[PDB]
């Protein structure tokens, strides 16, 4: 959803803790899109 001021210059350890403060644990739109593509493109026919 939101982002710190300069995310590109924040180390990924630190970016993780800022997101953690407002994060429900739910996968969100971008992760869910990439997992749908992984399964639909790399799993054998019928393996949903």
């Amino acid at each position: 959803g939101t982002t710190p001021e300069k995310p590109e210059e924040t180390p990924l350890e630190e970016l993780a803790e800022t997101f953690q403060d407002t994060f429900s644990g739910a996968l969100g739109k971008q992760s869910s899109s990439l997992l749908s593509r992984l399964i639909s493109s790399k799993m054998p026919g019928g393996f949903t």
């Binding site: 993780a16 953690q20 429900s24 644990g25 739910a26 996968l27």
Partner: peptide, 7 residues
């Protein structure tokens, strides 16, 4: 077994 949301 115990559940944990993803970090």
């Amino acid at each position: 077994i115990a559940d944990e949301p993803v970090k």
